[PDB]
Paper text:
The carbonic anhydrase (CA) family (CA, EC 4.2.1.1), consisting of twelve catalytically active human isozymes, performs the catalysis of reversible hydration of CO2 into bicarbonate and acid protons. Since it has been observed that CAIX isozyme is highly overexpressed in numerous cancers, it has been postulated that compounds inhibiting CAIX may possess the anticancer activity and may be used in tumor treatment. Here we have designed a series of compounds, methyl 5-sulfamoyl-benzoates, which bear a primary sulfonamide group, a well-known marker of CA inhibitors, and determined their affinities for all twelve CA isozymes.
The X-ray crystallographic structure of compound 3b bound to CAIX showed the structural position, while several structures of compounds bound to other CA isozymes showed structural reasons for compound selectivity towards CAIX. However, the binding affinities of 3b to CAIX and CAXII differed significantly and were 150 times stronger to CAIX than CAXII (Kd_intr = 0.030 nM or ΔGintr = −62.3 kJ/mol to CAXII and Kd_intr 0.20 pM or ΔGintr = −75.0 kJ/mol to CAIX). Again, the side chains interacting with 3b in CAIX and CAXII were different. They were more hydrophobic in CAIX (A203, L135, V131, L91, and Q67) and more hydrophilic in CAXII (N204, S135, V131, T91, and K68). Nevertheless, the native CAIX bound 3b 10-fold more strongly than the mimic-CAIX. The strongest binding ortho-sulfanyl-substituted benzenesulfonamides, especially compounds 3b and 4b, showed extremely high femtomolar intrinsic affinity (80 fM, corresponding to very high, 120 pM observed affinity) and selectivity for tumor-associated CAIX.
Author numbering:
A (entry chain C), B (entry chain A): 5 to 11, 15 to 50, 50A, 51 to 54, 54A, 54B, 55 to 72, 76 to 82, ...
Write the structure that this text describes.
């Protein structure tokens, strides 16, 4: 499968034609305040430099494979383990976040994909309720260089080639996310890539993460994709809520 | 395992010492109002008189096998098929509901047990989040004979003996349930019988169903359990929430 160009995605996976797909346009006015939604809890995210992690240009994103041991709770009894993180970005003067807020697209978005601790394998969790959970944060232009992000953005040149990978030192994975783990939107949707399986819990942080203009440019301008062509605008079109209600952890 | 003795239930099934067990004490003023909680949808529950349904004294409860085609939705895309229903009750002048409200135990309780349609088999769904969903209603004493419950209660005498069973005409299963499908409590817990699997979504109707005194006496007084003892007080003690917030569909 390619971005914005054949193949139909439903030719690749019927699930890409489901009624309850991601990403979505978040309208904070229409979100349901749900006080049951407690602050997210992360254990094991502060990684030592060794062992190193695989950072890959899979020709769709830059993917960082996460080691065993990264535990994430959405709340009492809702336990997950981190598998990987990847990013969605645009191009020079074109934003590329997947989620939008009242129609506004942010420059980029980080996703940390997690597997429910009721499942041994991703293939058993796909399409099952709460089988996968994604933590998503918007990236916005800031005045300072983000030094958490610099550790990965500095390695992109090594993996410019489509299908290329490198080993990078472990780092504080939680430092790539906002500091506010209490304020977020939550909804049930899908993977935004084939196979677009449903039953995914999306948590979208209200607080954004700041990258320098230079970092956003390194993200959007270094990697190559399928087809002597730049890896850019790697986001799926907004999908209708189709009657789903987005919950907010805050009034 | 019998009810009200040994073997301690952990010594039958370590799962019963899980951290997120059922039933629980509902305290409506600590419940979180969650406007995302939509009215329950129950299609296919109005059964014709044939085929007949298996009704069973299994020594723990009376259990009605439900046919295929009873479809239930907790939310958009979040669908279930009914498997069976059974009851929990007390004895002469003693209540036997499983769930309590502010400490109050009701005369009896009906459980309608469903399988998520993301799972082909019950055994795949046990322990998976949202794999099983139970609809629970409290049975309270009313002036009138409940004609929906009379179809089952009139048949208890035929199956009075542990392990005996009978065939009963199709009935409207939805007629055993309260009037307002928009008003309920919901939390995630467990089976209240071994193997005490967690990941069960419990939906407890705010409104109660009314049975006559005669009918409740028939329920608690007709059936024989393990050994030569009466099948009575077939409810599990209430369990700690351990941080779980009970949600409410109504303010
Ligand atoms: C540009 O989009 C992506 O490259 C991408 C985006 C996602 S997402 N946005 O989280 O759905 C996943 S997640 C999924 C892929 C299939 C197997 C489990 C992990 C994997 C990937 Cl590879
Ligand atoms: C007195 O309790 C019961 O008789 C009972 C109570 C339940 S409950 N309250 O729904 O957990 C189930 S459900 C379950 C048991 C075996 C696995 C699938 C269905 C089955 C039964 Cl048989
Ligand atoms: Zn993604
Ligand atoms: Zn039960």
């Amino acid at each position: 499968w390619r971005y914005g160009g054949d193949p139909p995605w439903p030719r690749v996976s019927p699930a890409c034609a489901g009624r309850f797909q991601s990403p979505v346009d978040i309208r904070p006015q229409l979100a349901a305040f749900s006080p049951a939604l407690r602050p997210l809890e992360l254990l094991g995210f502060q990684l030592p430099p060794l062992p190193e992690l695989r950072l890959r240009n899979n020709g769709h994103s830059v993917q960082l494979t996460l080691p065993p041991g990264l535990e994430m709770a959405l709340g009492p009894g809702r336990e997950y383990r981190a598998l990987q993180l990847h990013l969605h970005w645009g191009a020079a003067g074109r934003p590329g976040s997947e989620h939008t807020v009242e129609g506004h697209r942010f420059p980029a978005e980080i996703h940390v994909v997690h597997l429910s601790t009721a499942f041994a394998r991703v293939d058993e969790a796909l399409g099952r309720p709460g089988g996968l959970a994604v933590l998503a944060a918007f990236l916005e232009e800031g005045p300072e260089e983000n030094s958490a992000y610099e550790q990965l953005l500095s390695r992109l040149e090594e993996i410019a080639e489509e299908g290329s990978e490198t080993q990078v030192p472990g780092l504080d994975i939680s430092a790539l996310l906002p500091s506010d783990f209490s304020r977020y939107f939550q909804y049930e949707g899908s993977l935004t890539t084939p196979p677009c399986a449903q039953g995914v819990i999306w948590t979208v942080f209200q607080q954004t993460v700041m990258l320098s203009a230079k970092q956003l440019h390194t993200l959007s301008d270094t990697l190559w994709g399928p087809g002597d062509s730049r890896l850019q605008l790697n986001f799926r079109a907004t999908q209708p809520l189709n009657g789903r209600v987005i919950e907010a952890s805050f009034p």
